[PDB]
Symmetry: D2
Subunit: 494 residues, 4 copies
C-alpha cells in the first residue's frame, strides 16, 4: 500500500535516477527566443505550449521554428502543442468604456446585437444568442472571471433577462462571462479555431489542447476540423466546467487525453470539489491509459517572486501523487520573470514526489480492474510490468512505432524507466506527455528496417545503459511486435 510505503521512506535518501512526470511550458515573449527555449529544455521542458488565445499566426510560426531550432541544437525532441482559443461568451461595449454595477441594483442583459456598442449599467449586450433559452430564473451569470455575479429574475422578452446585481463590481468592455448551472451549447470549435487547427496541421504540430470540451461529439468536431491530414495529431480535451466533468467517461473514450483546468473549473465549482474532480479525472485517465495533464494555478506566485508558496509546492507534489502524467506552467513561463527557475523547481518537486510514490499500488489497482479474459496486448504489457517487479528489472525497452504500446506499458506504472525505441520522430515528441517514458529514434532510412528487431533492442539497451539505469548483470524487460506487442523478453544486461 501507499501507507506501508510511507513508513519505509527517508527524505535524506537520494532521489530516483529518473523523473517520470513531464513538464509542459507555455511559450510567450519571456521565452520565445531560441536561447530562452534552450534554457527551458535544459531546465526540464518536454512540451512547448502555444496559447492561441493571443498572438497571430506569424508569432506562433516563430515559436514553432524557434522550438525546433532549440531542440535541434540540444539534440532532443520537444513536443509542440496548439492550445485553441475556443468559443467564448463576452459582454459587448459600454457607453464610456465602463459600467458601475451596484449590489441590490437591477439590470438587463440582452441577446439583441443593437446594444453591442452602447451598453450601460442598466442594459447591456451578451454575444451568446441562445442565452435566454439556456438560462432559467434563479440561475447565475458570472462576468469578468466570476467577480461580478448576477442572478436572473425573469425574461423581460425573448432576448432580454431581468437580473439582480448581487455584488458591487465595476466592469469594462468585452469581459468574459460564465454560466455556472447551464449547459452551454456554443459550438465545439469556432471559426478561428478551424483556421488555427488547419494552420497547426500545416505546421505539423504534435497535439491539440482543445478548449472548453463539454461533450463527446465536440471531440469529433475537433477531429473533423483537423481533417484527413491531421489524423495522427493527438487531441487533448480541456475540462473546464461541470458539463465536461459530468460527461468525462464519453470524452475520455473519444479523445487522446485530458487536461484538468483547475482555475477554469473553479469559476463555477467550489474549490474543494475541484480538488476531488482532479482525483476523479486523473484516475479515469490512468485506467484508460490516456495522458492526463494537471494545469493552471501551478506555481503561479513564481511568475514575479523568485520562490513559490509552500501550498503551491504541495499542490504540485499531490498532482503527481494523484497520478498526473504532466504538470503545466502557464504565465510562469509565458510572461514570467523566472522561467528557468520555475521549470527547475517543478522538476525537483516532481522528482521528490516520485521518490515517495509507490508505483506498485498503481500497477496493482489497474491490473485488478482488467476483466478476464484479457486481450493479448493488455496481457503482454501488464505481464511485462509484472516481470519488472518480480525480477527487480532496472529498465524496460519497448519497440513501438506509433507509441501505442509504450503508452500501454506506461499505464501499468513499472518502478523503472521505460525506453521506447521508435522509427518515427513524431512518436518521440508525442510520448513527451506520457510519464516514465524516454524515446530513442531509430532511423530506418539510415539504418535499415531491422525486421528481426535486434538493432532497435540494442539501441534501447544502450540508451538505458548510457543514462546509468542498467549495468552489466542487471535485468531489462523487452517488449515488441503483426500489429501490437505480443512478445516479451527478459534480458540479462551484458
Amino acid at each position: 500500500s501507499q501507507l506501508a510505503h510511507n513508513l519505509t521512506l527517508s527524505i535524506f535518501d537520494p532521489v530516483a535516477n529518473y523523473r517520470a512526470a513531464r513538464i509542459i511550458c507555455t511559450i510567450g515573449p519571456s521565452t520565445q527566443s531560441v536561447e530562452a527555449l534552450k534554457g527551458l529544455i535544459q531546465s526540464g521542458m518536454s512540451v512547448a505550449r502555444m496559447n492561441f488565445s493571443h498572438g497571430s499566426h506569424e508569432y506562433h510560426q516563430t515559436t514553432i521554428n524557434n522550438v525546433r531550432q532549440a531542440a535541434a541544437e540540444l539534440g532532443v525532441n520537444i513536443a509542440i502543442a496548439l492550445d485553441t482559443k475556443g468559443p467564448e461568451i463576452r459582454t459587448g461595449q459600454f457607453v464610456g468604456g465602463d459600467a458601475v454595477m451596484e449590489r441590490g441594483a437591477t439590470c438587463y442583459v440582452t441577446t439583441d446585437p443593437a446594444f453591442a456598442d452602447k451598453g450601460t449599467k442598466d442594459k447591456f449586450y451578451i454575444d451568446y444568442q441562445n442565452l435566454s433559452k439556456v438560462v432559467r430564473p434563479g440561475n447565475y451569470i458570472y462576468i469578468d472571471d466570476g467577480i461580478l455575479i448576477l442572478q436572473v429574475q425573469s425574461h423581460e422578452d425573448e432576448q432580454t433577462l431581468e437580473c439582480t446585481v448581487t455584488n458591487s463590481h465595476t466592469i469594462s468592455d468585452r469581459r468574459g462571462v460564465n454560466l455556472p448551472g447551464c449547459d452551454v451549447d456554443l459550438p465545439a470549435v469556432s471559426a478561428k479555431d478551424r483556421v488555427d487547427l488547419q494552420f497547426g496541421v500545416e505546421q505539423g504540430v504534435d497535439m491539440i489542447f482543445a478548449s472548453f470540451i463539454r461533450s463527446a461529439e465536440q471531440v469529433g468536431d475537433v477531429r473533423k476540423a483537423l481533417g484527413p491530414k491531421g489524423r495522427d495529431i493527438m487531441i487533448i480535451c480541456k475540462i473546464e466546467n461541470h458539463q465536461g466533468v459530468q460527461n468525462i467517461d464519453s470524452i475520455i473514450e473519444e479523445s487522446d487525453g485530458i487536461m484538468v483546468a483547475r482555475g477554469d473549473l473553479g469559476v463555477e465549482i467550489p474549490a474543494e470539489k475541484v480538488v476531488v474532480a482532479q482525483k476523479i479525472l486523473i484516475s479515469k485517465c490512468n485506467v484508460a491509459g490516456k495522458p492526463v495533464i494537471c494545469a493552471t494555478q501551478m506555481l503561479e506566485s513564481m511568475t514575479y517572486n523568485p520562490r513559490p508558496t509552500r501550498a503551491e509546492v504541495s499542490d504540485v507534489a499531490n498532482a503527481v501523487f494523484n497520478g498526473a502524467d504532466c504538470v503545466m506552467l502557464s504565465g510562469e513561463t509565458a510572461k514570467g520573470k523566472y522561467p528557468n527557475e520555475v521549470v527547475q523547481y517543478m522538476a525537483r518537486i516532481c522528482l521528490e514526489a516520485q521518490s515517495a510514490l509507490n508505483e506498485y499500488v498503481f500497477f496493482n489497482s489497474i491490473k485488478k480492474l482488467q476483466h478476464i479474459p484479457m486481450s493479448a496486448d493488455e496481457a503482454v504489457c501488464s505481464s511485462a510490468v509484472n516481470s519488472v517487479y518480480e525480477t527487480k528489472a532496472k529498465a524496460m525497452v519497448v519497440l513501438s512505432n506509433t507509441g501505442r504500446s509504450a503508452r500501454l506499458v506506461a499505464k501499468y506504472r513499472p518502478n523503472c524507466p521505460i525506453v521506447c525505441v521508435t522509427t518515427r520522430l513524431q512518436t518521440c515528441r508525442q510520448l513527451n506527455i506520457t510519464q516514465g517514458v524516454e524515446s530513442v529514434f531509430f532511423d530506418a532510412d539510415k539504418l535499415g528496417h531491422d525486421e528481426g528487431k535486434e538493432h532497435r533492442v540494442a539501441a534501447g539497451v544502450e540508451f538505458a545503459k548510457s543514462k546509468g539505469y542498467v549495468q552489466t548483470g542487471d535485468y531489462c524487460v523487452v517488449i515488441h511486435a503483426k500489429g501490437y506487442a505480443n512478445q516479451t523478453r527478459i534480458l540479462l544486461v551484458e
Copy 2:
C-alpha cells in the same frame, strides 16, 4: 484501492453525515472573548490552542476561563492545549538596532556574551554556547526565518566563526537562528517552559504541544516537568527539524502524538521534502494509533482575505487524504479578520475530502501490517471494525474510560461514526484530537458503575440515534470490557 474508489465518485453526490477530522484553533485578540469562542465552537473548533510564545499567565488564564464558559454554555467539551515557547537560538543586539548584511561580505559570529549588546555587520552574538562545537566548515547558519543565509568558513577561535554572507538581507536585534545540518543539543524544556508547564498542570490543561522535540529522551524530560499531578496530560511532540524527523519512530513511541509543524520544518528543509515528511509522519502515527496534527500555513491568506487560495484548499484536503487526525489554525483565528468563516471553511474542506476518501484502504493497509499473533486488544478492535465493513453497520459504540480503546478503534478507520462512552470528562476533551470519534460522558458517581454496561451502551446508541447515524433495523458494533468484548447490536 483509492484509485478504484476515485472512479466511482461524483462531486455532486451528497457529503457524509459527519466530519471525522478535527480542527484546532489558536486563540488570540480576534477570538479570546466568550462570544467569539462560542462562534468558534459552533463553527467547528474542537481544541483551543494557547500559544505561549506570547502573552502572560494572566492572558492565558483569561483564555482558559473563557473556553470553559463558552463550552459549558453550549453544553459541549473542548480540549485546551498549551503550546510551549521552547528552546531558541537567537542573535544578540546590534549597534543602531540594525545590521546591513551584504552578499560576498565576510562576518564573524561569536559565542562570547560580551558582544550580546554591541553586534555589527562584521561581528555579532549568537546565544547558543555550543554553536562552534556543533558547526563545521561548510555548514550553514540561517538567520531571521532563514531569510539570511551564512556559510561557515572556519573557526577564528574557540568562540568565533568566520562566515560568508551568501545573500543580501538586513537583520534586526534578537532574530531567530536555525542550524540546518546540525544536531542542536539545546535542552528539551527551557526555563520559561518549566514555569509554563507547571502553570498548565495547575490549570488542568488537557495536552501539551511540546516545541522543538528532537529525540525520544526529550519526551521524558517534558514528562518529568509536568510531575505526578500532570501524568494524564497528553504530550504531543512538535517536529520541527531533521533530528525529530530522523528520530521519529522512537519519539512516536514515547509520545501521545505528533504535530507536523510544516513552517518550522520549512525554515531548514526544502518545501518539497517537507511535503514528503508530512506523508511519512502521518502514516507512522496512523500505524502507531496515535493522533497526528497537520499544523502551520493551512489557510493563511484567509487571515485577511475572505477566501483562501486554491492551493491552500488542496493543502487542507491533502492533509485529510494523508490521514491526519487534525488540521490546525494559527493567525487565521488568533489575529485574523474572519475567524468563524475560516473554521467553517476548514470544516467544509475536510468533509469534502472525507467523502472522497476510501477508509477501507486505511483499515486494510493497517490490518496487513499487524504482526501475528496479535494481542487481544488489537484483535478485538480490528475485528470490530472489520465487522462494521462486513455487516455495513452504521455506528460503533466504544466504552472507554481512559480513551485508549476508542483510539485503538479509531486507528482502524471504520467507515462510520465512533461514539465513545466514557466516565471521565478529561477523556471527552482529549479524544477531540482523535478523528472519527465523538464522546458521551457517563457520570458514574451520579448514575452508578453500570457493571452490566447496559446504561452506557444505551447512552451510546441514543447519541447515535439523536445524530441520525442509526435508526431502527441498523447494525451498531459495540465494544467494551481495555476492551475485549464485542457485540453486533440490532438498533431498536
Copy 3:
C-alpha cells in the same frame, strides 16, 4: 494453501491433542451388549447407528436401552440414529427357489402380481408397479447388487418388458433391483418407515438416516412422518443414486445433513465418478454448514481380518481431507470380529489426517463465499474463528442451547477444539455428528438459569483446561447470545 502446509509437515511430529472427526458405529449382534457398547465408546464411537433394515422393534429397543446404559456408566453422551429401511424394488419368487439367467438369452419382467410366486428364467415379477412407464428401450435393469444386468428391448404389453440377459448370473427369490438411468418415483417413506419413524419419535432418537433420498419433497415426507413431536429430530439424507446427486442443492437446503453412501452410488455410477461426487457433496455441506457423513466400504476388510488394506486406510484419510464431519462403520462393527480394533484404527487414521489438514484453507474458502453484507450471526461466528487464527487462541467456548451456533462456528473450521456449553442433553448428543466440537452439559435445573452467562463460560473454560487444551496465559475465544450469538469475548485463561 494445503500445498504450502504439506511442505512444513513431519510424520514424526506428535499428533494433535484432539480428534475433530466423529465416528458412527452401526450396532448389531457383535456389539449390542452394554460391555460391547462400552468398548465401542472408549474406542471412539460418538454415534450409534440402528439399521432398521434388520431386526424388530424389540431388538432395537434393546439397542437403545443398552446404548443409554453404556453411555451413563462412562459419563458421556452418545447419539442414537435410526437408519430407515426405505422403499425397495425387489423381484418376486421363483419356481424352485432359483433362476439360471444366461448371456444372450431373452427374458420377460412383469408388473403383473400374478407372477409374484411363480417366476422363471423366462418371465418373472418385479414389485415396482410404475416400472414400465419409467423404463424405456435401451435402459438397464440391475438385479442382485447389480451382478445381473438386463437390457430392455421393448414393451411386450402395458405390464411386461422384453429384456436381453447381458451376462450370466444365477438369481434367487426376492433379490434387490436397481434402475440406473431412471427417475424412480417410489414413495419417500414406505409404510414400515412411517411406523419405524413414530417408534423413533417415541423412543427419543436423536437423528434419522433417511434412506434413498432423491428429491427435496421427499425430505418433507420424512418430516411429516416424524410428526409435531419429532420436530427437533435431525433428518440426515442418504444420497444413494444419480437423482439424489442431481438434486443435491435442494436436498441439502431441506435436510439437516447428508450421508454419502458410496457403495450404493456405485451400483449405477462408475467408481471414479463416485469419488468426485463425494468431493462435491462434502464441499456443498461444508458451505451449507450441515454435517456430512462418509459411509459404506470404509474399513470393510477389517470385518474378518485384524488389519485393513492400505487403500482402505487411504480412503478414510481422504474422507477427512475432503472435509467430512463423520466417518461411518457398518458391518465392521455390526457383525465384525474386531469391533473395538476397527473403531480404534479409524480414530487413529482420522487423527493422523487432521494433523496434516490445513484448517485455514477451509476457513478462508468458506469466508470468501459469504456475500457482503453478512447477517450478524454469520459475521460473529466467522469473526470469532478469525480471532482464533489472529491470536492463536487454543480453544473456543460457544454457548448454544440448540447447537445451532456451535454448528455455525464449526463450519468455519478453527484450528482449535470447540467447546459447546448447552442446557440440553439432546444438543450434546446431536453435536456428535459435527466435527471439532465437544459438548458440556450445564444443568439449568440443578444450577440456575445463568442469565449473565458467567457460570456456563467457566464450565466451558474448565472443560477445555481439564483436557489440556488451554492453560494459564492462553487465549480462549468465547461466543454467546435474543436468539443467536451476537457477542464475542477474547479471554485470557487464568
Copy 4:
C-alpha cells in the same frame, strides 16, 4: 480454492480433452512381447519399467528391444526405466528350510556368518554386519515383509542380540528384514547394482529408479556409478524408509525426481502416516519442479480380478489430487491377467480426477512461494502460465532441448496442454514422467537449426491443432530461448 471448484462440478460433465498424468508399467511375462507392449502403449503406457530384482540381462535386453520396436511401430516415444534391486538385509538359511517362531519365545539373531547355513528358531543369521551397533534394546526387527516382529532385549555378545518373538509366524530361508527405528548404513549401490547400472548406460536407458535412497550423498554415489557416459540419465530416488523421508529436502535437491514407494514405506511405517508422507513428498517435488511417482499397490486386485476395489480407485484418484506426475503399475501389468484393461482404467481414473482438479490452486500456491527477486527463467515460466489463465489460452508451446524449461512450465500447472518441441529424442522419452506435457521431435540435422524458431513453433502449433487443443482464433502461449522469451500467439 479446490473447495470452491467442487461446488461447480457435475459428474455428468464431459471429461477433459487430454490426460495430464502419466502411467508407468512394469513389464513381465504378461507383457514382454511386442504385441503386448503395443497393447500397453495404446492403453496409455508412457514408461516401461524393468524390475531388476528379477530376470537376467538377457531378459531385460528382450524388454528393451521389444519396447523400442513396439514404439517405432506405433510411431511414438516410450521411456525405459531401470528399477534397481538395491542393498538388502536378509536372514540366512534354516535347518530344514523352515523356522517356527512363537509368541513369548526368546531367540538369538547373529552377525556371525558361521550360522548363515544352519539357523534355527533359537539362533539365526542376519547378513547386515553393522546390525548390533545400529540396533539398541527396545528396537524392533521386522522379518518377512514385517509379518514377524522381534523386539531386542540385549546384546548377548558383539555379534549377537537376544530377542523376544512378539508374534507367531513361520519364516523360511533368505527372508527380507527391516529395521524401523534405525539408520541403516548399508551402501547406496550394491555390487549387483553396479553391473546393472553399467548395463543400463550401455543400453541407453532413460532413467534409473534408484532403490532404498536414504541421504543426499547416496544420490551422488548412484551418479558416479553411471559414469560420464550416463550423465544425462535421470536418477529418480525411491523413498522407502524414515531416513529418505527425514532427508527428503536434500535428496530432492540432488535427484532428478522421487518415487513414493508406499508398500516399502508401509513395511516400517503405519499406513496412515504413509498416506501423509505421500502428500508431503508429492508437494515438495511439485515445488522443486521435479517429477514425483506414486508407486506400489495402486490397482492390485485387478491383477487377477477384472475390476478393482472401490478403495483402490479412490487411491488412484487421490494421488492425482495430491499432485503426482505419474502413477505406477507393478504386477498388474508384469504378471497380471488384464494388463490392457488395468492401464485403460488407470487412464480413465486419472482423467476423471484431472477434470475435478482445479489446476489454478496449484499454480497459485506454487507462485505464492517463489522468492522475490525471481531469476529470469522462473519469472518467464510463471508469467507464461499466468498468461494462459488471463487470456484463457488453449495450449502452450515450449521449445526445450534438454526438457528443463518444459519441466519448469509444467511445474506451474497451466490448465491447458503443454507441447514441448525438442531436438533430442531422449528429451521426448524423459518428459514422459512429467505431467501435462507432450513432446514433438524436431530433427535439426535433417531440417536445420531453425535459429528464427519459426519451424519449431509451427511444429508445436500444428501438433496442438492435430490434437484438437487449438483452432483458428485461439490463443497459444509460446515460450523459448533456458527460456526467456514469451509470445502470445493467435492461432491461424
